[PDB]
A paper describes a structure:
GRP78 is a molecular chaperone that resides in the lumen of the endoplasmic reticulum (ER). The GRP78 chaperone belongs to the Hsp70 family and it is composed of two domains, a nucleotide-binding domain (NBD) joined by a flexible linker to a substrate-binding domain (SBD). The chaperone function requires ATP hydrolysis, and substrate binding accelerates its ATPase activity. The malaria parasite possesses a functional GRP7815, which has been shown to regulate eIF2-α–mediated arrest of protein translation, an essential function during the schizont and gametocyte stages.
The crystal structure of PfGRP78-NBD in complex with ADP was determined at 2.3 Å resolution, and the final model included four chaperone-nucleotide complexes in the asymmetric unit related by non-crystallographic symmetry (NCS). As expected, all of the molecules showed unambiguous electron density for ADP and a Mg2+ atom in the active site, since these compounds were added prior to the crystallization process. The PfGRP78-NBD showed a classical HSP70 NBD structure composed by four subdomains (IA, IB, IIA, and IIB) arranged in two lobes, with the ATP binding site located at the bottom of the crevice between lobes I and II. In PfGRP78, the ATP binding site was sandwiched between the IA-IIA and IB-IIB subdomain interfaces. The bulk of the interactions with the base and sugar portions were associated with the IIA and IIB subdomains, including all the residues involved in H-bond contacts. While the phosphate moiety and the PO4 made extensive contacts, including 7 H-bonds, with residues from the IA and IIA subdomains; residues from the IB subdomain provided additional phosphate contacts; this subdomain also created a lid that trapped the ATP hydrolysis products. The presence of ADP and PO4 in the active site is consistent with a post-hydrolysis state, and it has been previously shown that product release is the rate-limiting step in GRP78 and other HSP70 ATPases19. All four molecules of PfGRP78-NBD in the asymmetric unit showed large inter-lobe interacting surfaces involving 117 residues and an average buried surface area of 2230Å2 (range from 2168 to 2313Å2). The first was between residues Y39 and K80 (K81 in human), and the second included residues K80 and E290 (E293 in human). These interactions were present in all four molecules of the asymmetric unit in the PfGRP78-NBD crystal structure, but were absent or not always present in the human protein. We propose that the lower substrate, product and inhibitor binding affinities observed for PfGRP78-NBD compared to the human chaperone are a consequence of a more rigid lobe I-II interface in the malaria protein.
Numbering used by the authors: 27 to 404
The structure:
Amino acid sequence: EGPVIGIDLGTTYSCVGVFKNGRVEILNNELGNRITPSYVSFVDGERKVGEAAKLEATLHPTQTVFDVKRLIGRKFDDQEVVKDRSLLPYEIVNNQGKPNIKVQIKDKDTTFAPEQISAMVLEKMKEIAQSFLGKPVKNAVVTVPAYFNDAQRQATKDAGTIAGLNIVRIINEPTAAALAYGLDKKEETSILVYDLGGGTFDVSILVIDNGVFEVYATAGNTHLGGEDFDQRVMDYFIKMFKKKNNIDLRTDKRAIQKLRKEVEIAKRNLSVVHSTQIEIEDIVEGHNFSETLTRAKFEELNDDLFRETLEPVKKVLDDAKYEKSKIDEIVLVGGSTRIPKIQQIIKEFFNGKEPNRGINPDEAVAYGAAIQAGIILG
Ligand SMILES: Nc1ncnc2c1ncn2[C@@H]1O[C@H](COP(=O)(O)OP(=O)(O)O)[C@@H](O)[C@H]1O
Ligand SMILES: [Mg+2]
């Protein structure tokens, strides 16, 4: 019936798009960003969603929730949830077989199902769409990884219900990005979707035959992405600060919070320019942090992790029994595909083959979902 919006509900960032006047508009949040962190905090009884929540992550690790997409539709006993709980800094309890996030609210223990946190992120995406369109939004197209089972797909629809959204269709993330580049109805082609995000890495082979995408092969690394590239820069500067001033910055959380924020900005900056400056006045009492980070240094610290992304690319091609030449189209997805070195490594692997270009790679999935939303509307 009414407006239908497309939403990219990602592990680390979220993005919303609308299809109006025969084109897609990727919407800005309160801070003027087309992307919103999938973080929720409950510090001093104040619920915050997005970048305001992401900032509390270091100072308040028990009150800040994120990476809830790794728990959604799963049992506490799942092999992947056991590996994740050991990595997540906030408390995850076993609520009679189902994982629950335990936080303190008004001095009381409060438990949330993973779909309750995801719904708070969807509530923010829905509100951005409502004030932009000037109309009530109920229907939405939401994306999910191609590997997501029936439980994970339904748990996402349930997060939508809590948020007041009727998720009319759940589509695959690599199918959404290929749709964004108008690759549907290309008749007899093979598409390789290289998706490197904040926390996960996914490679998918898509085949299009009469406007219908078939997910031919998938591979990846659930613990490889952007936040890893940060940690490597983080490690380097902590080591450097220890050898210069004899102070371990890891003991001071206010110091780690300032450095973490500056490292994320510095990394982004290196995607457009070749050098950047990290300046933090009084990182600790009586010490000013001032260091240069070159694009070259950023690449040297992450080279192994960058090339590691080619291992699942080799696997999809091997599983599909494909030569490199069989790939007709390359689609880059994820905030980390903005890294000039990552683009160069994929191009070099595909012997000079240029990928598709025209959409910000962190917005391509939400762009695809809004195209799908417009098809459903008619
Ligand atoms: N300009 C950029 N250059 C490099 N990395 C970027 C840039 N923009 C975003 N990123 C990184 O992209 C990652 C998030 O990826 P994204 O695809 O948006 O989310 P998700 O993984 O949740 O699907 C973060 O690690 C972020 O720092
Ligand atoms: Mg994504």
